[PDB]
Amino acid sequence: DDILSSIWTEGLLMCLIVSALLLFILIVALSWISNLDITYGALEKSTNPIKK
């Protein structure tokens, strides 16, 4: 009866920490990407009859 478990075998645990690892990376990479924001000032046409 030296098994670790019938349900939580060592093979399942090694596969669930690696998934946890690759998913931790992914969730970070999608935080950097969401915070992208476009620089709208250099695209719009703005003119003023005061300065020009």
Ligand X SMILES: CCCCCCCC/C=C\CCCCCCCC(=O)OC[C@H](COP(=O)(O)OCCN)OC(=O)CCCCCCC/C=C\CCCCCCCC
DSSP string, 1-52: ---S-SSS-HHHHHHHHHHHHHHHHHHHHHHHHHT----GGGTS----TTT-
Query: Is 5 near ligand X (CB under 6 A)?
Result: no
For CA atoms 40, 45, 51, 52, the dihedral sign is positive
Tell the smallest beta-carbon distance from residue 52 to ligand X (Å): 37
Query: Is 42 near ligand X (CB under 6 A)?
Result: no
Nearer to other proteins, 38 or 50 (CB): 38
Chain contacts with other proteins (rule: CB under 8 A) = 2, 4-5, 10-11, 13-15, 18-19, 22, 25-26, 29-30, 32-33, 36, 38-40, 42-45
